[PDB]
PDB file of C-alpha atoms and ligand atoms in Angstrom:
ATOM      1  CA  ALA A   1      -0.002   0.056  -0.026  1.00 48.53           C
ATOM      2  CA  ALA A   2       0.989   3.599  -0.589  1.00 50.57           C
ATOM      3  CA  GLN A   3      -0.275   6.652   1.263  1.00 51.92           C
ATOM      4  CA  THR A   4       0.717   9.861  -0.615  1.00 56.81           C
ATOM      5  CA  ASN A   5       1.381  13.151   1.241  1.00 56.84           C
ATOM      6  CA  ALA A   6       1.804  11.275   4.518  1.00 55.88           C
ATOM      7  CA  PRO A   7       3.258  12.963   7.544  1.00 53.29           C
ATOM      8  CA  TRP A   8       7.033  12.980   7.198  1.00 54.04           C
ATOM      9  CA  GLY A   9       7.588  10.493   9.998  1.00 55.28           C
ATOM     10  CA  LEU A  10       5.418   7.787   8.354  1.00 51.39           C
ATOM     11  CA  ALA A  11       7.289   8.241   5.074  1.00 51.70           C
ATOM     12  CA  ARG A  12      10.590   8.163   6.950  1.00 50.76           C
ATOM     13  CA  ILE A  13       9.816   4.791   8.569  1.00 47.73           C
ATOM     14  CA  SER A  14       9.280   3.135   5.147  1.00 47.42           C
ATOM     15  CA  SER A  15      12.247   4.852   3.429  1.00 43.71           C
ATOM     16  CA  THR A  16      15.999   4.201   3.054  1.00 42.84           C
ATOM     17  CA  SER A  17      16.335   7.987   2.621  1.00 41.32           C
ATOM     18  CA  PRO A  18      14.999  11.207   4.146  1.00 38.12           C
ATOM     19  CA  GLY A  19      13.080  13.761   2.179  1.00 39.74           C
ATOM     20  CA  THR A  20      10.174  11.656   0.752  1.00 41.42           C
ATOM     21  CA  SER A  21       6.471  11.984   1.428  1.00 39.89           C
ATOM     22  CA  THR A  22       4.751   8.630   0.625  1.00 38.75           C
ATOM     23  CA  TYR A  23       4.327   5.990   3.324  1.00 36.04           C
ATOM     24  CA  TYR A  24       4.529   2.441   2.011  1.00 36.73           C
ATOM     25  CA  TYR A  25       3.237  -0.530   4.113  1.00 37.76           C
ATOM     26  CA  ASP A  26       1.852  -3.971   3.845  1.00 37.59           C
ATOM     27  CA  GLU A  27      -1.913  -3.791   3.651  1.00 38.38           C
ATOM     28  CA  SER A  28      -2.293  -6.021   6.722  1.00 41.13           C
ATOM     29  CA  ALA A  29      -1.518  -2.831   8.633  1.00 42.47           C
ATOM     30  CA  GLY A  30      -1.405  -4.347  12.119  1.00 44.69           C
ATOM     31  CA  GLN A  31      -4.753  -6.114  11.878  1.00 42.61           C
ATOM     32  CA  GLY A  32      -5.118  -8.537  14.724  1.00 42.57           C
ATOM     33  CA  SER A  33      -2.627  -6.756  16.933  1.00 40.39           C
ATOM     34  CA  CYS A  34      -3.313  -4.467  19.874  1.00 44.92           C
ATOM     35  CA  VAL A  35      -1.494  -1.404  21.167  1.00 40.98           C
ATOM     36  CA  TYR A  36      -2.027   0.075  24.583  1.00 42.37           C
ATOM     37  CA  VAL A  37      -1.374   3.810  24.906  1.00 44.01           C
ATOM     38  CA  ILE A  38      -0.479   4.583  28.489  1.00 41.91           C
ATOM     39  CA  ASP A  39      -0.890   8.365  28.697  1.00 37.93           C
ATOM     40  CA  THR A  40      -3.584  11.028  29.224  1.00 38.06           C
ATOM     41  CA  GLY A  41      -6.203   8.886  27.546  1.00 35.59           C
ATOM     42  CA  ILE A  42      -7.575   8.642  23.965  1.00 38.50           C
ATOM     43  CA  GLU A  43     -10.437  10.535  22.347  1.00 38.32           C
ATOM     44  CA  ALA A  44     -11.797   7.335  20.940  1.00 36.83           C
ATOM     45  CA  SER A  45     -14.619   9.129  19.134  1.00 35.93           C
ATOM     46  CA  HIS A  46     -12.212  10.799  16.789  1.00 35.08           C
ATOM     47  CA  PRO A  47     -13.176   9.939  13.249  1.00 31.77           C
ATOM     48  CA  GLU A  48      -9.505   9.060  12.585  1.00 32.51           C
ATOM     49  CA  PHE A  49      -9.809   5.985  14.854  1.00 36.84           C
ATOM     50  CA  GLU A  50     -12.705   4.472  12.917  1.00 38.09           C
ATOM     51  CA  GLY A  51     -14.125   2.613  15.993  1.00 38.45           C
ATOM     52  CA  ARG A  52     -10.790   0.831  16.620  1.00 41.79           C
ATOM     53  CA  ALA A  53      -9.884   2.836  19.743  1.00 42.64           C
ATOM     54  CA  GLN A  54     -11.367   2.525  23.357  1.00 43.34           C
ATOM     55  CA  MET A  55     -10.628   3.600  26.806  1.00 43.77           C
ATOM     56  CA  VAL A  56     -10.070   0.588  29.019  1.00 40.92           C
ATOM     57  CA  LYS A  57      -8.812   2.166  32.230  1.00 41.46           C
ATOM     58  CA  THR A  58      -8.467   5.428  34.126  1.00 40.91           C
ATOM     59  CA  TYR A  59      -7.269   6.381  37.624  1.00 45.42           C
ATOM     60  CA  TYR A  60      -9.043   9.735  37.617  1.00 44.20           C
ATOM     61  CA  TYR A  61     -12.573  11.076  37.724  1.00 40.80           C
ATOM     62  CA  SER A  62     -12.884  10.575  33.958  1.00 41.02           C
ATOM     63  CA  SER A  63     -11.393   8.409  31.148  1.00 40.62           C
ATOM     64  CA  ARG A  64     -11.609  11.352  28.783  1.00 40.81           C
ATOM     65  CA  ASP A  65      -8.374  12.793  27.394  1.00 42.68           C
ATOM     66  CA  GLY A  66      -8.653  16.459  28.443  1.00 40.54           C
ATOM     67  CA  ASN A  67      -5.098  17.142  27.412  1.00 38.06           C
ATOM     68  CA  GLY A  68      -4.565  15.818  23.876  1.00 41.20           C
ATOM     69  CA  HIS A  69      -1.140  14.212  24.336  1.00 42.29           C
ATOM     70  CA  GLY A  70      -2.504  10.613  24.601  1.00 43.12           C
ATOM     71  CA  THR A  71      -4.790  11.218  21.641  1.00 44.62           C
ATOM     72  CA  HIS A  72      -1.849  12.456  19.585  1.00 43.18           C
ATOM     73  CA  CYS A  73       0.294   9.469  20.513  1.00 44.20           C
ATOM     74  CA  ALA A  74      -2.514   7.022  19.783  1.00 41.86           C
ATOM     75  CA  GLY A  75      -2.931   8.743  16.387  1.00 41.56           C
ATOM     76  CA  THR A  76       0.682   8.016  15.514  1.00 41.48           C
ATOM     77  CA  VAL A  77       0.274   4.374  16.501  1.00 39.27           C
ATOM     78  CA  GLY A  78      -2.913   3.642  14.553  1.00 37.79           C
ATOM     79  CA  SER A  79      -5.047   6.464  13.208  1.00 38.24           C
ATOM     80  CA  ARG A  80      -6.158   6.049   9.549  1.00 40.34           C
ATOM     81  CA  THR A  81      -4.222   9.103   8.258  1.00 40.83           C
ATOM     82  CA  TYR A  82      -1.491   9.679  10.875  1.00 40.66           C
ATOM     83  CA  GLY A  83      -0.827   6.125  12.090  1.00 37.89           C
ATOM     84  CA  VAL A  84       1.842   3.473  11.362  1.00 38.50           C
ATOM     85  CA  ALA A  85      -0.412   0.524  11.967  1.00 36.55           C
ATOM     86  CA  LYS A  86      -3.757   1.628  10.484  1.00 34.10           C
ATOM     87  CA  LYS A  87      -5.756  -1.487  11.382  1.00 35.08           C
ATOM     88  CA  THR A  88      -4.527  -2.158  14.927  1.00 36.47           C
ATOM     89  CA  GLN A  89      -6.808  -2.029  18.010  1.00 36.21           C
ATOM     90  CA  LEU A  90      -6.064   0.807  20.405  1.00 34.05           C
ATOM     91  CA  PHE A  91      -6.566   0.590  24.151  1.00 33.30           C
ATOM     92  CA  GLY A  92      -6.260   3.756  26.279  1.00 35.53           C
ATOM     93  CA  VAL A  93      -4.951   3.648  29.870  1.00 35.58           C
ATOM     94  CA  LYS A  94      -5.151   7.022  31.507  1.00 34.36           C
ATOM     95  CA  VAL A  95      -2.333   7.181  34.061  1.00 34.40           C
ATOM     96  CA  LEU A  96      -1.714  10.906  33.451  1.00 34.45           C
ATOM     97  CA  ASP A  97      -4.120  13.674  34.462  1.00 34.15           C
ATOM     98  CA  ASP A  98      -5.243  16.400  32.114  1.00 36.10           C
ATOM     99  CA  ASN A  99      -2.105  18.361  32.928  1.00 37.04           C
ATOM    100  CA  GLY A 100      -0.023  15.482  31.722  1.00 38.64           C
ATOM    101  CA  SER A 101       1.097  14.601  35.237  1.00 37.16           C
ATOM    102  CA  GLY A 102       1.030  11.297  37.069  1.00 35.96           C
ATOM    103  CA  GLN A 103       2.302   9.938  40.336  1.00 37.32           C
ATOM    104  CA  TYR A 104       4.663   7.029  39.925  1.00 38.94           C
ATOM    105  CA  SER A 105       2.325   4.747  41.924  1.00 37.75           C
ATOM    106  CA  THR A 106      -0.445   5.355  39.400  1.00 34.63           C
ATOM    107  CA  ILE A 107       1.872   4.851  36.443  1.00 37.04           C
ATOM    108  CA  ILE A 108       3.094   1.542  37.997  1.00 39.28           C
ATOM    109  CA  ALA A 109      -0.499   0.474  38.542  1.00 37.93           C
ATOM    110  CA  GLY A 110      -1.267   1.203  34.851  1.00 37.31           C
ATOM    111  CA  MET A 111       1.601  -0.999  33.619  1.00 36.53           C
ATOM    112  CA  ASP A 112       0.561  -3.885  35.806  1.00 36.22           C
ATOM    113  CA  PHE A 113      -2.975  -3.353  34.631  1.00 40.03           C
ATOM    114  CA  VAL A 114      -1.889  -3.837  31.038  1.00 40.41           C
ATOM    115  CA  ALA A 115       0.092  -7.022  31.875  1.00 41.82           C
ATOM    116  CA  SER A 116      -3.112  -8.541  33.132  1.00 42.97           C
ATOM    117  CA  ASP A 117      -5.642  -6.793  30.903  1.00 43.28           C
ATOM    118  CA  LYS A 118      -4.223  -8.188  27.696  1.00 44.28           C
ATOM    119  CA  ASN A 119      -5.770 -11.532  28.797  1.00 43.70           C
ATOM    120  CA  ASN A 120      -9.161  -9.822  28.382  1.00 43.66           C
ATOM    121  CA  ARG A 121      -8.466  -8.651  24.799  1.00 41.49           C
ATOM    122  CA  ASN A 122      -8.369 -10.328  21.392  1.00 39.70           C
ATOM    123  CA  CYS A 123      -4.834  -9.761  20.019  1.00 38.49           C
ATOM    124  CA  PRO A 124      -3.938 -12.895  18.096  1.00 40.13           C
ATOM    125  CA  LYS A 125      -1.019 -11.208  16.388  1.00 42.29           C
ATOM    126  CA  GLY A 126       0.426  -9.706  19.584  1.00 45.74           C
ATOM    127  CA  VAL A 127       0.306  -6.935  22.111  1.00 46.35           C
ATOM    128  CA  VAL A 128       2.365  -3.652  22.289  1.00 46.41           C
ATOM    129  CA  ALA A 129       2.430  -0.838  24.804  1.00 49.64           C
ATOM    130  CA  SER A 130       3.510   2.755  24.055  1.00 51.06           C
ATOM    131  CA  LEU A 131       4.617   4.716  27.132  1.00 50.29           C
ATOM    132  CA  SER A 132       5.180   8.377  26.189  1.00 53.23           C
ATOM    133  CA  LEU A 133       6.018   9.496  29.756  1.00 53.14           C
ATOM    134  CA  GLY A 134       8.901   9.485  32.257  1.00 54.11           C
ATOM    135  CA  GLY A 135      10.592  11.047  35.259  1.00 52.22           C
ATOM    136  CA  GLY A 136      13.690  10.625  37.388  1.00 49.98           C
ATOM    137  CA  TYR A 137      15.302   7.268  37.907  1.00 51.39           C
ATOM    138  CA  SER A 138      13.117   4.862  39.916  1.00 47.25           C
ATOM    139  CA  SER A 139      13.883   1.137  40.346  1.00 48.36           C
ATOM    140  CA  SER A 140      10.131   0.542  40.988  1.00 51.06           C
ATOM    141  CA  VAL A 141       9.157   2.247  37.716  1.00 51.11           C
ATOM    142  CA  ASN A 142      11.729   0.262  35.794  1.00 52.98           C
ATOM    143  CA  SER A 143      10.626  -2.987  37.433  1.00 54.25           C
ATOM    144  CA  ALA A 144       7.019  -2.354  36.466  1.00 53.67           C
ATOM    145  CA  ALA A 145       8.131  -1.753  32.806  1.00 50.58           C
ATOM    146  CA  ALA A 146      10.150  -4.970  33.036  1.00 50.46           C
ATOM    147  CA  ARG A 147       7.203  -6.948  34.332  1.00 54.67           C
ATOM    148  CA  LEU A 148       4.996  -5.644  31.553  1.00 56.26           C
ATOM    149  CA  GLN A 149       7.576  -6.718  28.901  1.00 54.43           C
ATOM    150  CA  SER A 150       8.120 -10.073  30.613  1.00 50.06           C
ATOM    151  CA  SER A 151       4.387 -10.800  30.570  1.00 51.88           C
ATOM    152  CA  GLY A 152       4.465 -10.801  26.713  1.00 55.05           C
ATOM    153  CA  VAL A 153       3.942  -7.140  25.753  1.00 53.68           C
ATOM    154  CA  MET A 154       6.383  -5.225  23.449  1.00 54.92           C
ATOM    155  CA  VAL A 155       7.125  -2.265  25.600  1.00 55.77           C
ATOM    156  CA  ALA A 156       8.254   0.982  23.915  1.00 60.88           C
ATOM    157  CA  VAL A 157       9.115   3.900  26.147  1.00 60.34           C
ATOM    158  CA  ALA A 158      10.178   7.512  25.507  1.00 61.46           C
ATOM    159  CA  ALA A 159      13.895   8.218  26.122  1.00 58.47           C
ATOM    160  CA  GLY A 160      13.002  11.706  27.552  1.00 54.61           C
ATOM    161  CA  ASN A 161      13.285  15.316  26.361  1.00 57.81           C
ATOM    162  CA  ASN A 162      16.177  16.516  28.554  1.00 61.31           C
ATOM    163  CA  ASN A 163      19.003  16.459  25.968  1.00 64.47           C
ATOM    164  CA  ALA A 164      20.727  14.294  28.570  1.00 63.76           C
ATOM    165  CA  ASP A 165      21.823  10.679  29.210  1.00 63.32           C
ATOM    166  CA  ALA A 166      18.671   8.619  29.666  1.00 67.86           C
ATOM    167  CA  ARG A 167      20.341   6.449  32.325  1.00 70.12           C
ATOM    168  CA  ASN A 168      18.959   8.947  34.863  1.00 73.04           C
ATOM    169  CA  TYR A 169      15.287   8.553  33.846  1.00 70.93           C
ATOM    170  CA  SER A 170      12.626   5.898  34.232  1.00 70.94           C
ATOM    171  CA  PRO A 171      11.267   3.851  32.575  1.00 72.05           C
ATOM    172  CA  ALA A 172      13.804   4.896  29.909  1.00 68.67           C
ATOM    173  CA  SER A 173      16.667   3.365  31.802  1.00 66.48           C
ATOM    174  CA  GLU A 174      15.099  -0.136  32.019  1.00 68.44           C
ATOM    175  CA  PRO A 175      17.315  -2.444  29.893  1.00 67.90           C
ATOM    176  CA  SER A 176      14.543  -4.965  29.012  1.00 67.06           C
ATOM    177  CA  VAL A 177      12.162  -2.469  27.328  1.00 67.89           C
ATOM    178  CA  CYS A 178      12.614  -0.589  24.077  1.00 65.41           C
ATOM    179  CA  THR A 179      13.864   2.959  24.761  1.00 62.88           C
ATOM    180  CA  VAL A 180      13.171   5.406  21.898  1.00 61.62           C
ATOM    181  CA  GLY A 181      15.024   8.609  21.008  1.00 57.10           C
ATOM    182  CA  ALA A 182      13.748  11.189  18.569  1.00 55.87           C
ATOM    183  CA  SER A 183      14.958  12.404  15.153  1.00 55.30           C
ATOM    184  CA  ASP A 184      13.917  15.227  12.809  1.00 54.69           C
ATOM    185  CA  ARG A 185      13.007  15.258   9.138  1.00 56.76           C
ATOM    186  CA  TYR A 186      16.652  15.917   8.165  1.00 57.99           C
ATOM    187  CA  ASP A 187      17.906  12.893  10.091  1.00 57.48           C
ATOM    188  CA  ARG A 188      19.342  14.959  12.936  1.00 58.46           C
ATOM    189  CA  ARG A 189      18.852  13.873  16.495  1.00 59.27           C
ATOM    190  CA  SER A 190      16.036  16.019  17.878  1.00 56.48           C
ATOM    191  CA  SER A 191      17.559  18.787  19.860  1.00 55.87           C
ATOM    192  CA  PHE A 192      15.666  17.797  22.989  1.00 55.00           C
ATOM    193  CA  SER A 193      16.180  14.034  22.636  1.00 54.73           C
ATOM    194  CA  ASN A 194      17.872  12.087  25.467  1.00 53.05           C
ATOM    195  CA  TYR A 195      20.687   9.732  24.442  1.00 55.52           C
ATOM    196  CA  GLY A 196      23.086   7.197  25.958  1.00 54.91           C
ATOM    197  CA  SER A 197      23.790   3.570  26.102  1.00 53.03           C
ATOM    198  CA  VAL A 198      20.238   2.683  27.285  1.00 52.35           C
ATOM    199  CA  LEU A 199      18.621   3.772  23.973  1.00 52.86           C
ATOM    200  CA  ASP A 200      17.660   1.003  21.554  1.00 49.19           C
ATOM    201  CA  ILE A 201      16.338   2.966  18.626  1.00 47.84           C
ATOM    202  CA  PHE A 202      15.327   6.312  17.196  1.00 48.03           C
ATOM    203  CA  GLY A 203      12.123   7.320  15.598  1.00 50.12           C
ATOM    204  CA  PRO A 204      10.632  10.505  14.118  1.00 52.94           C
ATOM    205  CA  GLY A 205       9.923  12.949  16.904  1.00 52.69           C
ATOM    206  CA  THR A 206      10.261  16.540  15.641  1.00 52.20           C
ATOM    207  CA  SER A 207       7.157  18.235  14.046  1.00 49.96           C
ATOM    208  CA  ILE A 208       4.821  15.189  14.055  1.00 51.05           C
ATOM    209  CA  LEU A 209       1.307  15.706  12.729  1.00 50.38           C
ATOM    210  CA  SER A 210      -1.394  13.557  14.441  1.00 54.75           C
ATOM    211  CA  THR A 211      -4.853  13.526  16.062  1.00 55.31           C
ATOM    212  CA  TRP A 212      -5.858  15.941  18.828  1.00 53.48           C
ATOM    213  CA  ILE A 213      -8.828  16.344  21.052  1.00 55.90           C
ATOM    214  CA  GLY A 214     -12.029  18.016  19.826  1.00 60.78           C
ATOM    215  CA  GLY A 215     -11.719  15.949  16.605  1.00 61.32           C
ATOM    216  CA  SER A 216      -8.827  18.062  15.550  1.00 59.47           C
ATOM    217  CA  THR A 217      -5.160  17.583  14.487  1.00 61.55           C
ATOM    218  CA  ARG A 218      -1.902  19.091  15.648  1.00 59.86           C
ATOM    219  CA  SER A 219       1.882  19.006  15.054  1.00 60.23           C
ATOM    220  CA  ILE A 220       3.911  18.592  18.208  1.00 60.13           C
ATOM    221  CA  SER A 221       7.419  17.246  19.129  1.00 57.82           C
ATOM    222  CA  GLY A 222       8.994  14.936  21.701  1.00 56.22           C
ATOM    223  CA  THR A 223      10.399  11.486  22.353  1.00 55.08           C
ATOM    224  CA  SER A 224       6.715  10.891  23.160  1.00 52.36           C
ATOM    225  CA  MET A 225       6.048  11.204  19.393  1.00 54.22           C
ATOM    226  CA  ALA A 226       8.917   8.899  18.415  1.00 50.95           C
ATOM    227  CA  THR A 227       7.783   6.199  20.817  1.00 50.36           C
ATOM    228  CA  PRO A 228       4.422   5.478  19.097  1.00 50.69           C
ATOM    229  CA  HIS A 229       6.123   5.223  15.723  1.00 47.53           C
ATOM    230  CA  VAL A 230       8.142   2.332  17.141  1.00 45.97           C
ATOM    231  CA  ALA A 231       5.097   0.883  18.933  1.00 45.94           C
ATOM    232  CA  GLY A 232       3.049   0.975  15.698  1.00 44.34           C
ATOM    233  CA  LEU A 233       5.943  -0.509  13.780  1.00 42.23           C
ATOM    234  CA  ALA A 234       6.218  -3.372  16.323  1.00 44.09           C
ATOM    235  CA  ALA A 235       2.493  -4.099  15.961  1.00 46.82           C
ATOM    236  CA  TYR A 236       2.714  -3.973  12.149  1.00 51.05           C
ATOM    237  CA  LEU A 237       5.688  -6.419  12.148  1.00 53.15           C
ATOM    238  CA  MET A 238       3.986  -8.711  14.653  1.00 56.00           C
ATOM    239  CA  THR A 239       0.898  -8.923  12.344  1.00 58.53           C
ATOM    240  CA  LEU A 240       3.263  -9.834   9.426  1.00 56.22           C
ATOM    241  CA  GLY A 241       4.719 -12.645  11.672  1.00 56.32           C
ATOM    242  CA  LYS A 242       8.275 -11.207  11.350  1.00 55.92           C
ATOM    243  CA  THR A 243       8.813 -10.923  15.090  1.00 59.60           C
ATOM    244  CA  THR A 244       7.199 -11.308  18.543  1.00 59.30           C
ATOM    245  CA  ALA A 245       6.751  -9.119  21.645  1.00 59.39           C
ATOM    246  CA  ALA A 246       9.968 -10.594  23.195  1.00 58.76           C
ATOM    247  CA  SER A 247      12.058  -9.942  20.142  1.00 58.91           C
ATOM    248  CA  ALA A 248      10.526  -6.976  18.387  1.00 54.21           C
ATOM    249  CA  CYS A 249      12.907  -4.307  19.826  1.00 50.90           C
ATOM    250  CA  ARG A 250      15.950  -6.356  18.763  1.00 47.59           C
ATOM    251  CA  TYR A 251      14.409  -7.018  15.385  1.00 46.42           C
ATOM    252  CA  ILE A 252      13.722  -3.367  14.859  1.00 49.45           C
ATOM    253  CA  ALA A 253      17.289  -2.537  15.776  1.00 49.41           C
ATOM    254  CA  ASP A 254      18.559  -5.336  13.570  1.00 49.84           C
ATOM    255  CA  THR A 255      16.655  -4.047  10.530  1.00 48.36           C
ATOM    256  CA  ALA A 256      17.022  -0.281  11.236  1.00 46.26           C
ATOM    257  CA  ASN A 257      18.566   2.279   8.900  1.00 44.18           C
ATOM    258  CA  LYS A 258      22.107   2.333  10.356  1.00 44.26           C
ATOM    259  CA  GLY A 259      24.589   5.213  10.711  1.00 42.73           C
ATOM    260  CA  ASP A 260      22.328   7.735   8.976  1.00 44.73           C
ATOM    261  CA  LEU A 261      21.538  10.187  11.840  1.00 42.90           C
ATOM    262  CA  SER A 262      23.587  13.154  12.728  1.00 39.44           C
ATOM    263  CA  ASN A 263      24.536  14.558  16.119  1.00 38.10           C
ATOM    264  CA  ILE A 264      24.409  11.192  17.839  1.00 37.58           C
ATOM    265  CA  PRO A 265      26.742  11.303  20.837  1.00 35.61           C
ATOM    266  CA  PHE A 266      29.627   8.932  20.811  1.00 35.65           C
ATOM    267  CA  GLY A 267      28.351   5.669  22.451  1.00 34.70           C
ATOM    268  CA  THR A 268      24.669   6.060  21.468  1.00 34.66           C
ATOM    269  CA  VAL A 269      23.155   3.736  18.808  1.00 33.74           C
ATOM    270  CA  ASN A 270      22.794   5.216  15.369  1.00 33.28           C
ATOM    271  CA  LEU A 271      19.726   3.332  14.346  1.00 35.75           C
ATOM    272  CA  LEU A 272      16.479   4.654  12.844  1.00 35.31           C
ATOM    273  CA  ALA A 273      13.285   2.577  12.799  1.00 36.03           C
ATOM    274  CA  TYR A 274      12.519   1.216   9.360  1.00 35.82           C
ATOM    275  CA  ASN A 275       9.891  -1.225   8.105  1.00 36.64           C
ATOM    276  CA  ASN A 276      11.934  -2.738   5.269  1.00 34.21           C
ATOM    277  CA  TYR A 277       8.766  -2.867   3.267  1.00 36.12           C
ATOM    278  CA  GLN A 278       9.208  -3.500  -0.491  1.00 32.91           C
ATOM    279  CA  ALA A 279       6.209  -2.283  -2.306  1.00 35.18           C
TER     280      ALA A 279
HETATM  281 CA1   CA B   1      15.313  -4.119  24.719  1.00 34.79          CA
HETATM  282 HG1   HG B   2       1.235  13.848  22.521  1.00 33.11          HG
HETATM  283 HG1   HG B   3       3.056  11.434  17.568  1.00 35.46          HG
END
């Protein structure tokens, strides 16, 4: 399949070169997979989700996304126009309030929720979770992310937006999950992107167009935007049978565009997520 005039990040993920605008992908499009978006929620009624999104959990007075961030991230995973895996099922877990804030205890509860909740969902091709959140180093937060991964969910987490070594942030610093840095449309490391040995992969993170609340759309930036490109890619590859939850991060790194990004600090991987799709 070919989607012309796609957001640059989608085009980038299916290209050996920057500077193109068509997204190419196998028509299976993540059908039969599921992606949890652990964030401020998802506006499931957005036309872009086509009935494939639902809220499954909140820790607040409402499950509505009153911020937009979670809706944007979900859009990059699986909206019809702005998404990587255009046929995946999307499940929203609201661990962040409408200010985008969440106590670590609530975030941890949300991760453990997903590890169990996948047993209540139909995801024959596999399960992914996108965590576009983070804070300072916490062994408890890392351990929760590790449990989620161990349970059979491909966990993708934001590296963080501090232009610093991600070793000092959680869940970014957890070795067993997929830690995602951000790049821009000219294949430069995004200026805010964290880096370091704990990163596994980069994805498009600067000036990313996606869904927003009130049935709208918005371009924003962050490692929070790169993460769902990787999460959607994992779901897409799992539907194709190319990899599994336990191996998807490694597979994505194995098959990435290599050595093509600029301003990658010495010691950080130079790997950009790539679907290796041949139309
Ligand atoms: Ca990993
Ligand atoms: Hg967002
Ligand atoms: Hg995004």
